[PDB]
UniProtKB/Swiss-Prot annotation, chain C:
Signal peptide: none annotated. The gene is NOG1. This is Nucleolar GTP-binding protein 1. Belongs to the TRAFAC class OBG-HflX-like GTPase superfamily. OBG GTPase family. NOG subfamily. It comes from the Eukaryota. It is found in: Nucleus, Nucleolus. The chain holds residues 510 to 552 of 661 of the full protein. Involved in the biogenesis of the 60S ribosomal subunit.
Amino acid sequence: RRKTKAERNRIKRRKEEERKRKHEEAMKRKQQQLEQAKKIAAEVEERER
Amino acid sequence: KVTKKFIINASQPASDKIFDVSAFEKFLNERIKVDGRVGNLGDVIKISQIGDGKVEIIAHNDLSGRYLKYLTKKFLKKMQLRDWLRVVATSKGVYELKFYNIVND
Amino acid sequence: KSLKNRAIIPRKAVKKPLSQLEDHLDQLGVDTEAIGLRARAQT
Amino acid sequence: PQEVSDIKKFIEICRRKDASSARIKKNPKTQQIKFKVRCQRFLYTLVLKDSDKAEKLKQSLPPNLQIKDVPKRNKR
Amino acid sequence: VNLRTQKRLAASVLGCGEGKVWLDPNEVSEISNANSRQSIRKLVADGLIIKKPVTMHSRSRARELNLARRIGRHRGFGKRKGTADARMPQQVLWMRRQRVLRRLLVKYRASGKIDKHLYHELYHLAKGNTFKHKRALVEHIHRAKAEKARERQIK
RNA sequence: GAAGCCAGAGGAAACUCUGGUGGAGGCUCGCAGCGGUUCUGACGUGCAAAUCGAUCGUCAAAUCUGAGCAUGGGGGCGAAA
RNA sequence: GGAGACGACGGCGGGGGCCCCGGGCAGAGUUCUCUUUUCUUCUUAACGGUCUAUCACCCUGGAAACAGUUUGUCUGGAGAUAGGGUUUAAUGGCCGGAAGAGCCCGACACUUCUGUCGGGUCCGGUGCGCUCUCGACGUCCCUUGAAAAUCCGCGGGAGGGAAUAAUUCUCACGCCAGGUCGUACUCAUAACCGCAGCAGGUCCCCAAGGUGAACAGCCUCUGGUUGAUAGAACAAUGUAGAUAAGGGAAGUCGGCAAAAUAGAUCCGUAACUUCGGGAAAAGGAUUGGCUCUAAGGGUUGGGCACGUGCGUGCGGUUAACAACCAACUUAGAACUGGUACGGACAGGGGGAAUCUGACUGUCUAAUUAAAACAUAGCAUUGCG
């Protein structure tokens, strides 16, 4: 059936919440890599070796 | 309920007996208006002296330091001190009265 | 005031003469010798 | 100018031979820290929240790459 | 002592017109010794050259007239100079009214107050200039609903 | 305010009437621009070997205009004076 | 095969910039009185990443009780509505650039050399506004509104290619190179032409505020000027601008010139006509200020039972209700000053006829702009 303006606005809010959640997850992943920075540097040096 | 503290420092002209702190307090009491009307301070705005030629203001409304500077300049113009005293913001919410730059002739 | 044609130069950009400040405060009734405006005046 | 979001890729960029220099910009109002590396084609920027281990990333960056703190005034 | 070059350099340094440059008349010799933009910047920093502030153009009377016209003053036949269409176009009025009516009809059809056939019929009435405004359209919709309810109760 | 379109009232229909919408025209008032009607105009060894003022024509096009290029005297070009 | 690569005009929608409104920090001005006041700075490039933005296209499904839909009536069994997607298109949001810049304010130092150090650079709103740009429509044509260099995709399958590993990968990063000439300044009441520093002429881009329909006239901001021989006096006659009692064209070849009319709302408008016009015909009523009233809008938001913020299966059209937000027009009324009310500016005199050319248009640069010329229409002649 034909959806209403409230349903369309709810879908738009869902999309905005999804984008914000993805951005927050990306920031947390970057923070976790910053936590495990030394292991990453050792792995990169081993790969170059 | 939020509060804001404002300081009007006039220590140098007050010690020089040029600026009258009590007269300035009376002028502020009779001129600061709340909701577009003077004589409507109540518990919203409190004006006191903390000594050393300073006037201290508690405001619970959105009273602005630009309005306080405007009233200070009005008082200086009434006291014929506008051409010789200057109101300068020195900190967040602190306005100091001081002499303009003087050249020795 | 000539605000129709030009703006007034700000007071902070003009150095006030010591003699004129002396005269104005003296008519206002301030004993300037007790406060020492001579030391406050720059050169 | 390019922004790097991966710590591993930033470490490889800093270990690249064309990395001329690196600089650290501290923004206390935003409470962030930026690591900028100058390569041949691009300047790469890694943006981090200002933190002690964020400062400690300097010891993970290569020693031969010079690292300078950005001063408050860009004097000519 | 000629200071045309110094006034030009001071205007270029201060980023203003030459009519906004003030040169100190009591140190015309010190200003005349300045032949470079570096010396001009030095005199600006020392205060011998300043930028005069702009001339006043207040908007207070325009704002007062705007509030007066908003509350309804100065709108009389002695005040009008253009034609009625020149002041407010009938095409713009029609376009606004049609957009309002079609927006309300789309909202009602989406909400389910009116059905598809009544929507179509009211759309063509709105295009054919039956309704003068939204209140008129709403009253017509209410009357149609009342007649439909009466017919359903009779049947 | 031309076609085209919407609605209502009629009409067996074709059509008629009414209210809107629409925005056509080598249409029209008029700013700039282009032009040059009139004034016992200014000027008349002038600001000027054709200028100045007011007034006037036209103003969405047979409108105005640049650069490049073409036509050369027994010629060219000419909405033709 | 596509791009390069294309007319004019009309309205509509999106975006940037400008204009406007509100709050905040700082600075400046006003201050007899009033004014929480008036004004100023509050900015973000190329180049990129990321998330999005009309048209259009795809999938399900099969529509009359026809539906969707634009300001403008187009679309749909050649598949519409609805639901779900894919994409052309940024001068949109965020981020990198990039605050370290620029701007604003303050405090010390300072023979000069020279500066040094602090604090901020923020948050919104509105639109028949102006300008540029983009998009979808529409109108007109006996008018249909460039070419080439250059770039890309595809059809095709010749060649070239692997585990001694191969790679002839329009991906990312890395290496190298990019010559010649112009570049100042004026672009005009003094930098060009007119014999000149000549009131003439000479192609364009950007274009603020108020009144107002309006890049009209008038006043103002930024930016520019204050340059065009000066001083004194106020005779005639001039040039330019005005007024004049009573009469009102008696003036003069001739109402030449001047005066009168003029904007807008409303009432009303004849003959004639090619039926399109005439027409703003004619002739009338009104217009200031103040205080009010009324009308014309936008956004958001419905109850259960389960699974678990969505999915269903239901149930209802008084949301005809609440909360929030917003701008300009129109109509009506009271009060009130008056010699004036489109108070300056701006701005049709009108009518009855005749001759004449159909009309729009064009020409005698420097004495004639017209019944002259051209025009559409019509007629004739020649040519296969």
